[PDB]
Amino acid sequence: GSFDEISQYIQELEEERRLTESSIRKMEKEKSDLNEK
């Protein structure tokens, strides 16, 4: 039973990992916007 519950939360955490990357890439674009101005 613990095999599936732990693995399911890993995917949710891995989903958050992609979400963090999206914010990171957007922050670089926001940084580029600040650089241009």
Binding site: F3, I10, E16, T20, I24, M27, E30, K37
Partner: protein, 62 residues
């Protein structure tokens, strides 16, 4: 320019901090997804002696 520099520092501070915060969880999940293979063997192992306990009773029936 100070407002933009403060904005640049605010963005850059979060930018690098989020990268470290994300990579520490990402590399931890790389071991966690490998632990899923261990959990696959764990599920295999736990059910194995459960059937052995059944087999501990089953061969007694013979």
């Amino acid at each position: 320019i100070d407002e933009l520099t403060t904005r640049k520092c605010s963005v850059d501070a979060r930018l690098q901090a989020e990268n470290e915060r994300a990579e520490r969880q990402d590399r931890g999940l790389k071991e966690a997804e490998t632990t899923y293979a261990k959990l696959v063997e764990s599920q295999k192992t736990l059910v194995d002696f459960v059937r052995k306990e059944y087999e501990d009773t089953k061969h007694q029936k013979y």
